[PDB]
Amino acid sequence: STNLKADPEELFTKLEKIGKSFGEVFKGIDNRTQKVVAIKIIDLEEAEDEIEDIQQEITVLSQCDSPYVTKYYGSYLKDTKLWIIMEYLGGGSALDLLEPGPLDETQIATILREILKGLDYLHSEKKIHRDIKAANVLLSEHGEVKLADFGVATPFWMAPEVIKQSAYDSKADIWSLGITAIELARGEPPHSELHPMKVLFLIPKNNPPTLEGNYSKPLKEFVEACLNKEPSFRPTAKELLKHKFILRNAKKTSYLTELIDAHHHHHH
């Protein structure tokens, strides 16, 4: 829960404004430990309609304890400002890492495997991420891959049952993972050139997207397995960890430092 006694302005120093996000996000330092943290500051008088959503995200993150989910350290409330203290990951988001150029299939498989480990954790804990996309997958400077920015309980990554405002479950994350696989391979999710309101009707109406281009058969098959219109027919995260695409192509996460280094030199 939130600390209303301690002054976060004395506990933390802001180092950099980051997260170009709801509320302002900073790379910061815990003055006592000298560990770097991510700090989101939300003015609760400005964000009154979103307060329950904020509380729900804090609650879910506070219940997670996994190397695959960005850690929640705590929160502070000073005057009208809520400070949320999180683990800082310095490598970049998976979306950021698409900037230098296309990923190879080893990089795609490695990132997907780690996302699957986070989904396996969340689904085993009766949680649903709800916003799996490359922008919400964060890498440490060592190549560790973690999930961030859970969705509240833009349409391009949403499963058809979620769009139809129907009951849904963890299988919605598997659909979003399939869209994210396309995004990691092509740079953008399907329908990215279309107005979001048109995408709202296309996703439930149309056959599921496919991965188009010169990619290995197992990668195309991985995408196809995830993007089943029927949620019950999508595999679980545990099953996808055994998929031929993953087993044949995923490697040690430390190899992703080469991708991180490339982004240091080629970025907007």
Ligand SMILES: Cc1cccc(-c2ccc(-c3cc4cnc(NCCCN5CCCC5=O)nc4n(CCCCN)c3=O)c(Cl)c2)n1
């Ligand atoms: C409303 C609510 C309720 C509960 C928690 C939060 C919340 C969600 C996410 C976070 C957050 C953490 C975070 C950790 N590392 C990084 N590393 C930056 C990577 C990119 N680089 C590299 C060089 C400089 C730079 O910019 N960025 C983080 N970002 C910003 C990116 C979001 C992507 N979707 C966060 O927003 C927090 Cl603190 C609280 N929110």
